[PDB]
Design a protein around this ligand. Structure first.
Ligand SMILES: Nc1ncnc2c1ncn2[C@@H]1O[C@@H]2COP(=O)(O)O[C@H]2[C@H]1O
Ligand SMILES: Nc1ncnc2c1ncn2[C@@H]1O[C@@H]2COP(=O)(O)O[C@H]2[C@H]1O
Ligand SMILES: [Mg+2]
Ligand SMILES: [Mg+2]
Lengths: 226, 225
DNA sequence: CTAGGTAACATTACTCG
DNA sequence: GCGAGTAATGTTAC
DNA sequence: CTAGGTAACATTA
DNA sequence: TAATGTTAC
């Protein structure tokens, strides 16, 4: 696995072909059984992971016991890069939820590659900006809106993780997350997330067949609003 | 021109690009109570604050406000829509009479791509922000209001100190409780009774303008047991 | 069942010709 | 040395 | 005053 | 067995 295969992942897309193909120069394989830790939020991160198979959850856990699911990453995802670029410890907790395999990249190699072909820095920056926006809109979502709108804005944001650049009218969606996973992302409780999803359905915002939600984008945008 | 080292991002530069090539600020000022730019807007310019207080905030159609930051001297804002083609991501309001220096998109970026280990600086900044913002998000999501206030005081104290943390540290906070309610995504009266709560529980004491925080009582109000 | 939001009212505190 | 314009703080009843 | 949390219980593939 | 739905408070 080293073609134009490295263009599938965020950040690494957007590279010149030289650094790219030559870039499976510095991956090692690894794998993690279903239900195990890759690393913890305390930890030292001198390696960045790139996901080939499986589902890995990035989440914040609090001493009280509470969880904020930051992301569920599957094939084509990139995580663990902040503590690479920035001297700081890991900023979240990475758990394999199902049997997963990826490729790891070292700190010294990566960074040398950045500083060697420096318009790749540019790529990485456009990524961190992207994240910062994503995260601030999450924060606004959780702060200024109620739970129905929170769920609505979650569906519209993922229906931009799929379309984006703009948006039909009725779009089916394979969501792959349980409602416990949605409760964890939205910083709410399972039963109330459930009643909210059902609410969106009974109000004509969505309908749910098994694995598939046909969302009504717009019909969903004013539930997301007033 | 070691004056350009006072601001985030620009600190951390080689002296060549720093004293020079910055070369590329215009003066500008904004009266107390006015808009610099709006969240819709096109941002091809980045601001660097010399005097005054400017609030960066998100406003919703419903009318609600999330204060993202109150920046004063030594602050840098408006850089995301520079680096990234996208519109402005928040709303910048001068709360008091403010003055700054503006830097254009084309100049800035040319400077990045000309001395490329400055990119490195900028990245360490965006990482910093991303962490800051995710810890905010965790704060607002997994904790109650007393802990939210507590974690706000510790974050502003780890910004003044950081890398050390004493035991009792006084703090000049400069924000009203309405400003704290707006940052924490809560309501003024409940923020007030929370602050008072921290005081009556021995976490802080408030003299006029100054809060002597007790870092550690304050850390387990920020937590459980 | 509970931590908060909202409207409304009273004081203190800045502050500016 | 104000008196008139604002805020900022604290509390209470929904 | 009331969204939204919590503990528990039922229906479902 | 896990995923979804509901209820009382
Ligand atoms: N807000 C966020 N959005 C998406 N991914 C994040 C966020 N915060 C942290 N991460 C990822 O989680 C990783 C945890 O370890 P690092 O902090 O080394 O690198 C981090 C990022 O790759
Ligand atoms: N999470 C955040 N934390 C601090 N400042 C932010 C955040 N999001 C946006 N900003 C600032 O607000 C500015 C709004 O316009 P820009 O998006 O051009 O640049 C932005 C940043 O300077
Ligand atoms: Mg969102
Ligand atoms: Mg905080």
């Amino acid at each position: 696995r080293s073609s134009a295969f490295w263009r599938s992942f965020p950040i690494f897309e957007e590279f010149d072909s030289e650094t790219l193909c030559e870039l499976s120069g510095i991956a090692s394989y690894r794998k993690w059984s279903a239900g195990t830790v890759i690393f913890q939020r305390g930890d030292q991160g001198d390696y960045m992971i790139v996901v080939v198979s499986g589902r890995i959850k990035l989440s914040l856990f609090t001493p009280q016991g509470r969880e904020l699911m930051l992301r569920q990453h599957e094939a084509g995802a990139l995580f663990g890069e902040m503590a690479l670029l920035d001297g700081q410890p890991r900023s979240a907790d990475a758990t394999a939820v199902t049997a997963a395999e990826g490729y790891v990249i070292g700190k010294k190699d990566f960074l040398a590659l950045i500083t060697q072909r420096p318009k790749t820095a540019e790529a990485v920056i456009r990524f961190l900006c992207a994240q910062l926006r994503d995260t601030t809109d999450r924060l606004e979502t959780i702060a200024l809106y109620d739970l129905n709108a929170r769920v609505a804005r979650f569906f519209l944001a993922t229906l931009r993780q799929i379309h984006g650049s703009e948006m039909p009218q009725s779009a089916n969606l394979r969501l792959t997350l349980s409602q416990t996973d949605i409760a964890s992302i939205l910083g709410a409780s399972r039963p109330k997330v459930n009643r909210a999803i059902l609410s969106l359905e009974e109000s004509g915002a969505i309908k749910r067949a098994d694995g598939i939600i046909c969302c009504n984008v717009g019909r969903l945008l004013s539930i997301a609003d007033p």
